[PDB]
């Protein structure tokens, strides 16, 4: 039934400065010569309080997909700090990697991300306004969350 199956996601360049682009090595399997494109997205949760502060870092259309095992590195630019509420800038947040077929999301891989200052003085006495040039992004890559959804694969 499910034409596409995500086998693995590897977090590359981690930890890294806040401004470095995200890099995930994704491996997936395709059952047939999939008729429509697969739409991969990297979504950054800018604020746990509201979905309005989500930033879609990149949206990619992969296809035609021939039947078989495939692997690619999904790279996406770091979020725009100008849209992140200061209260949510430092500490834990989530980055999501989703895939969508025919406008239906079928997989969501989430990673908890902890943004922290690297200097001891800044860790103990954080600036009034976050300094994204001094933040390090530490993705909690040993604990990924995978959620699969039932979609209509028929054409």
């Amino acid at each position: 039934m499910a034409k596409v199956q995500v086998n693995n996601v590897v977090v590359l360049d981690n930890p890294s400065p806040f401004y470095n682009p995200f890099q995930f090595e994704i491996t997936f399997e395709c059952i047939e010569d999939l008729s429509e494109d697969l739409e991969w997205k990297i979504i950054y949760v800018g604020s746990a309080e509201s979905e309005e502060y989500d930033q879609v870092l990149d949206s990619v259309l992969v296809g035609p997909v021939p039947a078989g095992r495939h692997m690619f590195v999904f790279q996406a630019d770091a979020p725009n700090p100008g849209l992140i509420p200061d209260a949510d800038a430092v500490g834990v947040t989530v980055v999501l990697i989703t895939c969508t077929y025919r406008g239906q999301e079928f997989i969501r891989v989430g990673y908890y991300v902890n943004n922290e200052y690297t200097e001891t003085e800044l860790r103990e006495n954080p600036p009034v306004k976050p300094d994204f040039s001094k933040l390090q992004r530490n993705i909690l890559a040993s604990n990924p969350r995978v959620t699969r959804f039932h979609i209509n694969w028929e054409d």
Partner: peptide
């Protein structure tokens, strides 16, 4: 409440 909200987002 931040952890509960973030957990709902991943689900």
């Amino acid at each position: 409440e931040k952890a509960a909200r973030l957990a709902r987002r991943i689900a």
